[PDB]
Design a protein around this ligand. Structure first.
Ligand code: LMN
Ligand code: LMN
Ligand code: T7X
Ligand code: T7X
Ligand code: CPL
Ligand code: 3PE
Ligand code: 3PE
Ligand code: 3PE
Ligand code: 3PE
Ligand code: 3PE
Ligand code: 3PE
Lengths: 89, 91, 90, 469, 178, 481
């Protein structure tokens, strides 16, 4: 499924070849999840099957919690150093 | 750029091929671009209720898969307790 | 601020014993010779001579013995053999 | 019992002061023990290998999963003892080992995620459980946030585990797109013959397996293990490995996989050779974990793997706990404390441990020889069962590589004992403070299991024959 | 045994080695430190493309050539192929002891690989788990994994050969008088 | 009893503080007990006699009285009784040979030595492949610790060699034992000659067993660990390693290999003869250029083991009897030579370099006489068990292959050369300038040496005295149609 697949692949490449900042890594994670959900929802429509949409809903909730925890981790990392380097990890 | 190009081609092609069921690899890739046809949308009259996607999701999430909802409640609990644990300094 | 517990009392490690008089008068030259001979494997290198010895004893000699031992297997029987009888079986 | 403990603990800890931490942990410790001894009898349900689907076919309970759950409970009991009980009562040890307010809750939630992974019968259950365990493990890695290394490790964990979680999700959704199903139960011999699922199922296997750090994606997890506080490292290098490996063993989705064969070989080679030049204790133990992961990876290539996997994972868990406990016990005898999160860093700091505590070094010797595989220690019988399994199924080259890796990793296992039995110049005469009775008893029980467990081998096989056949 | 087509199979190997070396060069270029441009990837490759290509040619060509010449398929062909591959890889040392060491030791490791079946996973049908095992029935031929209580003496004479104690007739029976 | 005897041990330790008198007493009782067993051993029967099973599921901590055998089996026939007698003769002497020279942490040292002895003794009782393998490996960590803590200057490298080489061979033996286990679903030695595997599978299983044999014997070309390990070991380690542990390999050939893989063994015998002839000749010649006394003595054992191998693989009754007799005689004489070089000379002078030693006869005539006697015993002078073993082994080897055994007859000369070259310099010439005069041999040292010499002389004059335990054995393993 084209749009989801392209979004996932390009987001993965952006994550991997990121040499600019850490926020790009966070964004690439979020958008890879978006691409996966798009592929899933198209298949859910083509099968007329609720299982795909149920999994997509769960994916959305988990992406929210993962975002919250990832940004908490980033803030805890910031607390000791006061800055994020372009290699900040 | 070299690695980006090789990875682009390989990952895109493989992500289109994982969907096929043909034994031959070239046919696997070819099926990806194989929707030259329109789907025929037809009517029937067996659904008398006004049930939409949201209603059906609620129906399966709260009855068939209630366990998944409760585990998700635990995950949200984690999304509260964890941030507080590492962003707040007690005492 | 991170230090081992003050409660610990460490003394020296003495294995004890009676120091005997030194019955051997060590020769440094002999000791150096013995050290060179004992740890020769640490300095070995593959040259023409050492390689030739390697080829004679680890390759050639085993091959000669093996040819002999597989050619002569079952060939001889000697017990009570008489005149005119063959001592070979093949 | 676990869910109840998590709810009660959140409430109780919320109403408790930071000085109550250890007390609270002690409470939960005894609670877990009680659950293990009063609820054990439920094993009877699985007589003759009866399998139960539960929760509208979301969960699967059998004798294999029941055993894994008991093992995880036992591990949690041992590890929580290390936070609830002080090794010594002096100021330095208060500084070295103090439990955080929320750590016990994070441990219990992570254990829940692991147990749900083990029992997962549907892919939505698997993904929710995997994310529960992953998020918990990130927070556990981060909760000691005064440490620079721990915070950096938590960030690295978050990002690599997120990429691998994405790979797992994509695998599951490709499986759904091919079969309109979310359960492996829909796979039959006819379906496997008819369709090519190999790429999908191996993608799922690799997504799971890179999360416990097999080669060639081993360095990031080894870095995280090195850079966490030691009492965190004991937990985070064991529980995920057990949960993921147990799920893959029970799922049997990679039988006779060429890709898994090659990665298992690479993992054995990398784990054995890459441990050789290590000078830090935790890096050495991490490479040991990598090699033992390769051993267990071999069992994903064959059916009827349950006995050899259960034996190996049990004895390995026991040995891992024992070696970390021994390293913790040796902290009292070292000259130089490197920092408050990792009081001991270098193998050379154990030099002459025999002159300070001889029986600690005897315990170390037993554990090291078990890792090497000397009979009649448990490690020998684990390796023997694995060899029986793989040679029954024709994996000859891999059996030779297994032998070679065992011999190679013996060198870095013997490094610990070697430095530990050398001489040191200033040795201990007396000390007024004794190490804790509770933790010493736990360590001794582990040592005794490693030493004398073989006595029960035939009895164990007899029971296994009636609960797993 | 019908022959391998050494030329075509070896050309295929050439292509695959070149591709794999190109990929390794790209990865090497991305993972390194210091300034790096798009043309330096082969400049700072370390000759990795040549490693891949030369190993591919040596192994596949030698394996096919030895198999065709002996008209057999077994581990010995892989021993020869590994010997040639080790020769290629040890040429990079530029030292005769190291060249010899690579030759013999890679040849031995690949002979060990070929002897086990020349595979990393298993041949499932031939394995003990998928094979007739245990004690054979009445007078059946013994197969690889099967066990008997007595083998036929004719089989022993054929396999071991006559001599040094192996005889077609037991001694006491043959030396009985009438 | 066990409770009471443990109390006895505990109180002795509390009051004396040195465990060694108790260990000497326990080992002497063990020897007496084995002699009592020999008294009640039936010789007109080729069946295992004093059987017991351990760790059965019905009685994990007791003896098995069950109708299903799933524990570890133990029992003895005449062959195993021979080696058990050798073991219980040797153990107290290995305790007594270190009576005075171990001073720091001596309780641990004696515990390690006695444990190694007991493990070997149990190894000779094992009646199945797994019990045999377990007791086979269990000595390695004990030896590692003993050599590492109580060895000479190079003892770290030595401990690592003694662990790693033996583990290396043992793991290929383990492959073979696993294959036997899964193919036959049985592992015991009582009926394993009743199972006839296909010739191909036999040929494969043989390789693993023989790699382990090659490292443990040792044979050329994987022998180079033994001189190092012998040279750096403390005296009890050397005595056990040369007198007992090397005999486990010969026993393994008889017990584990020949009854099960008979046809493959026939097929492989010429390769064995190649390896053994290489061992004999090359190690004998390599001994001529050694400068360490203990290394020279260690190299001697390898050549004698080669002769024993040639005997035991000869497919003749004389060859197998000669191999066993040679094993026993070597177990008498080699520990005596190690006692001389690493117990008497080394405790007086703390050095092993040959250049330092010359003309010991002047101040120590008794030690010189012992050296001469043990040297001529070691090179197979008749009326010594060494001569009987070597002569019968060479007879069997010559029958098995006339050319190979005929060439093997040069070992008489080669052994004479290296041994008498050492003793000539040790006894003759003027007293060395580098060493001061010390005491001649003590009463304890003379006692040990006298025991060993009398044993080798008794079996040298009348080797037939072993036959009542071995006459079934010399027929149990030959394969003739
Ligand atoms: C086969 C045909 C091999 C033909 C080659 C003979 C060979 C291989 C021996 C391998 C044996 C393997 C056996 C293992 C088992 C095999 C199954 C041993 O040649 C040896 O011959 C000895 C005797 O002449 C020499 O010993 C002593 O030497 C003198 C010192 O004073 C005394 O004159 C002599 O008295 C001593 O004794 C050695 O120096 C020499 O290495 C190599 O020799 C030659 O190869 C070349 C290229 O590598 C080597 O490097 C070259 O020189 C280097 C700077 O020098 C630089 O790098 C470079 O300039 C160049 O690269 C050299 O080594 C060269 O010499
Ligand atoms: C201590 C040193 C360890 C190293 C030595 C191990 C070497 C293992 C080799 C031996 C062995 C495994 C035996 C395992 C036993 C336990 C394993 C031992 C421990 C393992 C650590 C592998 O045999 C392999 O040999 C290779 C050649 O070298 C072949 O290479 C390849 O060749 C080409 C492909 O066609 C390709 O071109 C290429 O892919 C390679 O070139 C392989 O295909 C072949 O499978 C033999 O097993 C097999 O034997 C055969 C007939 O014997 C059995 O079937 C028989 O059928 C009738 C006749 O057929 C008989 O009438 C019948 O009676 C019997 O039923 C089988 O059932 C099976 O059992
Ligand atoms: C997060 C980042 C997110 C990014 C997402 C974008 C990625 C999308 C797709 C990627 C997914 C993840 C990729 C993972 C790596 C893929 C590697 C992989 O699966 O193992 C292979 C793939 O077998 C293909 O046949 C598959 C062959 C590969 C397809 C051909 C390559 C096409 C490229 C063209 C150039 C599985 O065979 P296997 O090991 O069981 O090997 C054998 C064999 O298949 C059978 O003959 C045997 O019967 C069987 O028992 C077994 O032994
Ligand atoms: C099958 C495998 C499954 C399980 C096998 C594992 C273990 C065996 C089973 C149960 C283990 C339970 C054992 C209870 C009996 C053990 C026992 O004597 O008490 C404790 C340890 O006690 C645990 O630390 C209790 C810890 C319990 C957790 C142990 C789990 C390991 C040791 O006594 P102790 O004389 O040193 O204790 C004294 C004394 O109690 C104090 O009053 C003194 O002031 C103090 O100086 C102290 O030394
Ligand atoms: C009074 C309540 C106490 C119970 C608390 C148990 C806690 C488990 C904690 C840690 C795990 C340690 C190993 C568990 C033992 C396996 C039992 C079993 O036989 O395992 C079998 C399955 O064998 C296997 O797959 C292989 C297991 C591999 C074991 C490897 C270690 C062997 C050495 C252990 C020596 C035994 C020490 C005894 C000391 C006298 C499952 O047996 P089962 O599922 O029918 O349950 C048993 C009935 N039960 C619930 C009442 C207990
Ligand atoms: C256990 C059951 C079997 C015991 C059999 C012997 C019982 C009595 C042992 C004994 O006599 O004591 C040994 C030794 C001496 O006691 P002691 O004088 O108190 O030590 C000096 C400092 N206190 O006590 C000690 O010194 C203890 C020092 C231990 C030294 C650690 C290094 C040795 C490690 C042994 C390797 C074991 C490996 C296991 C693998 C399989 C082995 C087959
Ligand atoms: C077109 C179609 C034809 C081509 C198809 C062939 C595909 C093979 C391509 C492989 C390219 C090589 C990958 C690579 O570049 O590895 C290098 C990378 C780092 O290596 P580098 O930085 O260059 O040097 C370090 C030296 N100390 O190292 C890595 O991190 C990569 C990790 C290894 C790659 C995974 C391969 C798994 C299989 C390993 C085999 C293990 C052996 C088992 C037998
Ligand atoms: C302590 C350390 C001890 C470790 C011992 C050494 C470990 C191994 C070292 C490396 C050995 C490498 C062996 C390479 C063998 C080359 C080979 O191709 O073997 C194949 C050969 C025949 O195989 P096959 O196809 O079945 O032919 C049947 C015709 N009769 O198979 C054979 O017939 C055997 C050929 C080799 C003979 C064994 C070599 C020594 C082992
Ligand atoms: C029969 C041959 C016996 C004699 C050759 C012994 C091998 C050898 O030549 O030496 C070891 C060699 C590296 O040492 P080398 O450079 O040759 O010599 C240094 C100074 N003479 O070793 C090498 O040349 C390197 C070869 C490494 C190949 C490893 C093969 C894979 C190992 C398992 C994975
Ligand atoms: C850690 C290494 C691996 C450990 C695995 C193995 C551990 C074994 C532990 C040692 C215990 C074995 C020795 C005790 C068992 C023998 C007890 C016995 O009674 O033997 C039974 C046998 C028949 O007796 P029964 O059928 O009852 O009839 C009697 C009629 N009057 O009666 C007999 O025929 C007598 C049998 C004599 C056997 C001689 C045993 C010599 C050695 C004894 C102590 C060895 C201690 C070794 C310690 C180091 C660990 C190996
Ligand atoms: C690495 C190091 C590994 C060390 C391995 C050592 C394992 C040792 C396991 C000990 C089990 C083997 C004991 C041999 C059996 C000897 C015996 O019979 O002891 C008497 C008693 C049972 O006797 P019974 O079954 O009645 O048979 C005799 C009838 N005439 O037996 C009993 O009552 C039990 C007494 C033994 C208790 C052992 C406790 C473990 C050690 C602490």
């Amino acid at each position: 499924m084209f749009i989801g697949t392209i979004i996932l692949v390009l987001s993965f490449l952006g994550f991997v070849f990121n040499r600019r900042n850490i926020i790009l890594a966070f964004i690439c994670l979020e958008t890879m999840l978006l691409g996966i959900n798009l592929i899933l929802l198209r298949n859910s429509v083509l099968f007329d099957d609720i299982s795909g949409s149920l999994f997509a809903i769960v994916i959305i909730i988990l992406a929210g919690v993962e975002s919250a925890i990832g940004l908490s981790l980033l803030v805890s990392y910031y607390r000791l150093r006061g800055v994020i380097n372009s290699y900040g990890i | 750029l070299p690695l980006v190009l090789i990875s682009l081609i390989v990952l895109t092609i493989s992500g289109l091929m994982i969907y096929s069921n043909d034994s031959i690899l070239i046919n696997k890739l070819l099926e990806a671009f194989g929707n030259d046809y329109n789907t025929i949308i037809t009517q029937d009259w067996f659904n008398i209720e006004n049930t939409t996607l949201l209603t059906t999701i609620g129906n399966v999430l709260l009855t068939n898969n209630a366990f998944i909802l409760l585990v998700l409640a635990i995950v949200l609990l984690l999304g509260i307790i964890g941030p507080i644990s590492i962003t707040m300094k007690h005492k | 601020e991170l230090k081992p517990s003050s409660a610990i009392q460490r003394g020296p490690l003495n294995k004890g014993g009676w120091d005997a008089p030194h019955a051997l008068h060590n020769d440094g030259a002999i000791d150096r010779y013995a050290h060179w001979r004992t740890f020769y494997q640490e300095r070995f290198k593959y040259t023409r001579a050492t390689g030739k010895s390697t080829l004679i004893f680890l390759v050639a000699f085993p091959a000669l013995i093996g040819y002999v031992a597989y050619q002569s297997e079952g060939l001889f029987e000697f017990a009570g053999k008489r005149r005119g009888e063959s001592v070979t079986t093949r | 019992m676990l869910i109840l403990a998590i709810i009660s603990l959140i409430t109780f800890v919320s109403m408790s002061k930071l000085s109550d931490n250890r007390a609270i942990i002690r409470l939960i410790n005894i609670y877990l023990i009680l659950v293990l001894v009063l609820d054990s009898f439920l094993y009877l349900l699985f007589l003759n290998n009866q399998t139960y689907t539960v929760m509208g076919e979301l969960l699967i309970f059998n004798s294999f999963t029941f055993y894994i759950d008991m093992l995880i409970y036992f591990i949690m009991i041992v590890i929580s003892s290390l936070y609830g009980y002080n090794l010594y009562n002096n100021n330095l040890y208060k500084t070295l080992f103090e439990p955080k307010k929320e750590l016990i809750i994070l441990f219990l939630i992570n254990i829940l995620g692991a147990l749900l992974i083990v029992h997962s019968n549907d892919f939505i259950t698997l993904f929710v459980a995997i994310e529960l365990q992953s998020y918990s493990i990130y927070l556990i890695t981060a909760i000691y946030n005064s440490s620079y290394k721990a915070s950096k490790a938590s960030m690295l964990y978050f990002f690599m585990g997120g990429i691998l979680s994405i790979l797992i999700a994509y695998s599951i959704n490709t499986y759904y797109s091919v079969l309109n199903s979310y359960t492996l139960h829909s796979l039959d011999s006819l379906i496997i013959n008819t369709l090519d699922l190999n790429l999908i199922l191996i993608a799922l296997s690799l997504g799971l397996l890179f999360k416990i750090g097999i080669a060639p994606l081993h360095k990031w997890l080894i870095s995280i293990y090195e850079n966490t506080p030691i009492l965190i490292t004991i937990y985070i290098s064991l529980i995920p490995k057990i949960s993921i490996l147990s799920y893959l063993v029970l799922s049997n989705i990679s039988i006779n996989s060429l890709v898994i064969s090659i990665l298992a070989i690479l993992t054995l080679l990398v784990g054995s050779v890459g441990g050789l030049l290590q000078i830090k204790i935790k890096r050495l133990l991490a490479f040991s974990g990598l090699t033992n992961a390769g051993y267990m990876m071999l069992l994903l290539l064959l059916n009827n793997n349950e006995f050899s996997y259960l034996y190996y994972i049990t004895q390995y868990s026991i040995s891992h706990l024992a070696i970390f406990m021994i390293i913790i016990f040796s902290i009292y005898y070292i000259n130089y404390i490197n920092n408050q999160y990792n009081p001991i860093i270098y193998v050379n700091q154990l030099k002459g441990l025999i002159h300070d505590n001889a029986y600690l070094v005897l315990s170390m010797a037993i554990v090291v020889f078990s890792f090497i595989g000397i009979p009649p220690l448990l490690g020998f019988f684990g390796k023997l069962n694995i060899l029986m399994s793989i040679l029954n199924n024709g994996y000859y080259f891999i059996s030779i590589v297994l032998i070679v890796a065992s011999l190679i990793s013996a060198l870095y296992y013997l490094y610990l004992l070697n430095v530990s039995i050398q001489d040191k110049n200033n040795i201990l005469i007396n000390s007024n403070e004794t190490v804790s009775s509770v933790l010493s008893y736990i360590l001794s029980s582990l040592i005794i299991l490693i030493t004398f467990g073989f006595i029960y081998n035939s009895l164990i096989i007899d029971i296994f024959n009636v609960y797993f056949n | 045994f019908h022959p391998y087509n050494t030329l075509g199979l070896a050309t295929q190997s050439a292509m695959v080695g070149l591709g794999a070396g190109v990929v390794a060069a790209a990865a090497r270029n991305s993972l390194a430190t210091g300034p790096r441009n798009i043309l330096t990837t082969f400049s700072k490759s370390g000759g990795v493309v040549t490693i891949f290509t030369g190993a591919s040619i040596a192994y596949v060509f030698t394996y096919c050539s030895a198999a065709n010449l002996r008209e057999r398929k077994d581990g010995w062909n892989h021993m020869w192929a590994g010997a040639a591959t080790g020769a290629v890889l040890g040429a990079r040392t530029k030292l005769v002891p190291a060249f010899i060491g690579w030759t013999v030791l890679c040849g031995a490791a690949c002979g060990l690989f070929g002897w086990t079946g020349a595979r990393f996973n298993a041949d499932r049908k031939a394995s003990l788990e998928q094979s007739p095992k245990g004690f054979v029935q009445e007078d059946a031929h013994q197969t690889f994994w099967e066990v008997v209580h007595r083998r036929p003496l004719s089989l022993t004479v054929e396999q071991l050969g006559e001599g040094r104690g192996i005889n077609a007739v037991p001694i006491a029976t043959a030396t009985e008088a009438p | 009893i066990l409770l009471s005897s443990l109390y006895l041990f505990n109180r002795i330790l509390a009051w004396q503080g040195n465990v060694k008198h108790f260990y000497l007493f326990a080992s002497n009782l063990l020897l007496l007990f084995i002699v009592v067993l020999y008294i009640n051993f039936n010789t007109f029967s080729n069946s295992f006699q004093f059987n017991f099973e351990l760790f059965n599921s019905l009685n994990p901590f007791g003896l098995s009285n069950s109708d299903i055998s799933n524990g570890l089996l133990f029992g003895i026939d005449g062959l195993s009784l021979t080696f058990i007698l050798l073991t219980v003769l040797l153990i107290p002497l290995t305790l007594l040979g270190n009576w005075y020279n171990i001073n720091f942490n001596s309780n641990l040292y004696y515990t390690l030595v006695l444990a190694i002895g007991l493990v070997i003794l149990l190894n000779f009782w094992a009646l199945d492949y797994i019990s045999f393998y377990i007791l086979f490996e269990a000595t390695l960590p004990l030896l590692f610790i003993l050599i590492h803590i109580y060895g000479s200057s190079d003892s770290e490298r030595a401990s690592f060699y003694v662990l790693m080489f033996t583990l290396s061979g043992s793991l290929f033996m383990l492959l073979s034992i696993v294959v036997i286990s899964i193919v036959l679903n049985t592992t015991n030695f009582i009926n394993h000659n009743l199972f006839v595997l296909s010739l191909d599978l036999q040929t494969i299983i043989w390789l693993g067993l023989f790699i382990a044999i090659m490292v443990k014997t040792p044979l050329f070309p994987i022998h180079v660990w033994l001189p190092v390990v012998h040279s750096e070991s403390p005296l009890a380690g050397s005595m056990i390693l040369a007198g007992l542990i090397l005999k486990l390999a010969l026993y393994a050939i008889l017990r584990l290999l020949l009854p099960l893989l008979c046809e493959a063994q026939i097929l492989y015998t010429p390769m064995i003869y190649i390896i053994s002839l290489l061992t004999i000749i090359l190690t004998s010649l390599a001994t001529l250029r050694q400068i360490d006394l203990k290394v020279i003595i260690a190299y001697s054992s390898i050549s004698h083991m080669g002769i024993a191998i040639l005997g035991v693989c000869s497919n003749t009754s004389l060859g197998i009897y000669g191999s066993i007799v040679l094993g026993v005689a070597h177990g008498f004489v080699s520990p005596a030579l190690f006692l001389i070089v690493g117990g008497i000379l080394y405790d007086r002078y703390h050095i092993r370099i040959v250049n330092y030693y010359k003309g010991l006869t002047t101040y120590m005539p008794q030690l010189a006489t012992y050296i001469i006697i043990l040297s001529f015993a070691n090179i197979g002078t008749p009326l010594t068990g060494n001569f009987t073993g070597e002569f019968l082994s060479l007879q069997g080897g010559f029958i098995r292959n006339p050319i190979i055994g005929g060439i093997s007859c040069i070992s008489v000369l080669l052994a004479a050369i290296y041994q008498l070259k050492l003793t000539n310099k040790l006894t003759g010439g003027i007293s060395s300038i580098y060493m001061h005069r010390t005491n001649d041999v003590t009463i304890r040292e003379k006692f040990i040496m006298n025991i060993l010499i009398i044993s080798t002389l008794i079996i040298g004059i009348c080797p037939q005295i072993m036959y009542n335990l071995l006459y079934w054995t010399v027929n149990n393993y030959i394969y003739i149609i």
